[PDB]
Amino acid sequence: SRIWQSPRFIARKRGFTVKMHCYMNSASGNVSWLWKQEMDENPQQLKLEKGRMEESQNESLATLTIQGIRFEDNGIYFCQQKCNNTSEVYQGCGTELRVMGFSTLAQLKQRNTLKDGIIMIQTLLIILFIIVPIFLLLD
């Protein structure tokens, strides 16, 4: 309630663009962004890949833009403002991203049974081509 981030949960598909916001009054310190993942305990400083992630700032709003999202972007992201007066770090609530796909839940079972059938069918021939011709030679 001096910082305020929005939203609380995003769910886009693969390949699209997301934006995140943080409402503060930018005459007190500078906002920095942080990333916590499923396997973390304390959030870390975020490394910005050039040409894919941007980070911009008005007089009353800070913004993070991520373009072309994929599976290794899933996580929970925070803005943080350090005051010029009391040195009390204030932190926002936290936005969560989850990257989705295009198919439905009935078409995923299809390609799973397809890939398992392909891999088993061409395991059997490799066995048979090393059982059969040696069995012919041993008489």
């Binding site: 409402y23 295009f102 021939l125």
Partner: protein, 252 residues
């Protein structure tokens, strides 16, 4: 010549115990020849003697202003006793009587609704927060605003407006910056009326969490990933036919 007005207590002094209500008897337009003012304070016929008289003052057009104050009790006003101020003047040929009391009827309690800003108002530099209070009787009420336990001052209230069925309503408006609402601060409307529970209530107003979801996958299906698998199971089929056919001729 002189005029007499009689004024009731405040709508808030009778609702709390750490304040003091009082009724007021005011006589204006007293000439310079007869500045003698005679008061009598009757309560239900019985005349009491603990009022207080303030001294006069000189107006523009040679007139005076006399103020008489009587303190009352908190539960004597809330029942319907009648108050009489009697002014006798040597100039006026007859004494003057005025009476006040509380409006008669069965009380009803109000209903309080806070309302957030319009979405077309968020392109300005100041926004308006609204509190609607409806369905009460009599028309005595008190409405205040605050935030973080400290009061806010930039608000206004309309008069009570008579409704279609013998009751009243009003609204109140607070103006704040766009910065303070957009950053997550919480604001409270506080109401005091006599038919409420312990004479008080509060309601709050602020901003809420959100979601952002994506549409649907039940009509259109896929195709930047199904096309690769349908063009890669084909060459599996042709390849396995050719290599098993090449293994056929070595048997015979």
């Amino acid at each position: 010549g002189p005029s007499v007005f009689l004024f009731p207590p405040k709508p808030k002094d009778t609702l709390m115990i750490s304040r003091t209500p009082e009724v007021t008897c005011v006589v204006v337009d007293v000439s310079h020849e007869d500045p003698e003012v005679k008061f009598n304070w009757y309560v239900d016929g019985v005349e009491v003697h603990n009022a207080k008289t303030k001294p006069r003052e000189e107006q523009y057009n040679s007139t005076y202003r006399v103020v008489s104050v009587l303190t009352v009790l908190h539960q004597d006003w809330l029942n319907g006793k009648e108050y009489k101020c009697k002014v006798s003047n040597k100039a006026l040929p007859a004494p003057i009587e005025k009476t006040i009391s509380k409006a008669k009827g069965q009380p009803r309690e109000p209903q309080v609704y806070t309302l957030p800003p319009s979405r077309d108002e968020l392109t300005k530099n100041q926004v308006s927060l609204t509190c609607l209070v409806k369905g009460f009787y009599p028309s005595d009420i008190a409405v205040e605003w605050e935030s973080n336990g400290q009061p806010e001052n930039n608000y206004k209230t309309t008069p009570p407006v008579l409704d279609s069925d013998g009751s009243f309503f009003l609204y109140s408006k607070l103006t704040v910056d766009k910065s303070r609402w957009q950053q997550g601060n919480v604001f409270s409307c506080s109401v005091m009326h006599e038919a409420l529970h312990n004479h008080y209530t509060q309601k709050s107003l602020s901003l809420s969490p959100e979601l952002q979801l994506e549409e649907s996958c039940a009509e259109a299906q896929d195709g930047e990933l199904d096309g690769l698998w349908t063009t890669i199971t084909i060459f599996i089929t042709l390849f396995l036919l050719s290599v098993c056919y090449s293994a056929t001729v070595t048997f015979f």
